[PDB]
Amino acid sequence: YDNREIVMKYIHYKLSQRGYEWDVVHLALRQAGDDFSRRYRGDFAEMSSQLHLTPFTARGRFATVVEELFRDGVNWGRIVAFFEFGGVMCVESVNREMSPLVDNIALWMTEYLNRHLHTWIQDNGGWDAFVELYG
Numbered sequence: 001y002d003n004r005e006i007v008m009k010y011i012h013y014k015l016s017q018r019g020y021e022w023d024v025v026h027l028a029l030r031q032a033g034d035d036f037s038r039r040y041r042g043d044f045a046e047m048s049s050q051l052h053l054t055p056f057t058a059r060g061r062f063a064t065v066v067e068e069l070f071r072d073g074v075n076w077g078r079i080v081a082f083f084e085f086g087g088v089m090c091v092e093s094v095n096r097e098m099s100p101l102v103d104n105i106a107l108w109m110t111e112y113l114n115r116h117l118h119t120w121i122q123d124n125g126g127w128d129a130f131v132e133l134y135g
């Protein structure tokens with residue numbers, strides 16, 4: 001599997017959900033993602049209005065979130081949360097007419113997967129183990 005591809009398809013789909021067209025594992029991830037954000041809809045709504053996304057704040061938001069999310073370790077719930085959060089930054093990017101931020105966000109999600117999560121993903125059955133959770 002390829003992390004960059006997984007990021008790109010996921011971000012494409014979330015944006016597509018919202019009528020914005022952007023320049024197996026994917027299916028499982030979005031199903032997980034939808035159940036995750038429906039369960040925490042209120043929290044995602046609070047978080048959205050607090051984000052004050054701009055090109056100046058966006059790297060810092062990303063790092064703050066990701067650092068808080070994985071501080072105690074990694075599990076699949078937290079990786080689903082990580083995609084949902086990325087989706088939220090890209091949706092908000094678009095809402096506020098900072099669409100070029102999407103490319104940064106996608107790049108940051110990829111670096112962080114390849115760099116810092118890849119190891120744990122392997123020890124836990126690769127992406128295949130996650131698919132043998134959602135079909």
Ligand SMILES: CCCCN(CCCC)C(=O)c1nn(-c2ccc(C(=O)NS(=O)(=O)c3ccc4ccc(I)cc4c3)cc2C(=O)N2CCc3ccccc3C2)c(C)c1Cl
Nearest residue numbers: 032035036039040043044047068069076077078080081085
């Ligand atoms: C987008 C998430 C990061 C946002 N921040 C920081 C806010 C700005 C600083 C967090 O506070 C944070 N969230 N997690 C979680 C991570 C995982 C879960 C979680 O897994 N919950 S679950 O077990 O009920 C669940 C729920 C649905 C699931 C669906 C599919 C699958 I596979 C697994 C699922 C698991 C909950 C949580 C968590 O604590 N919350 C309540 C806080 C919150 C705030 C905004 C959005 C979602 C959430 C979920 C953590 C550790 C942090 Cl720290």
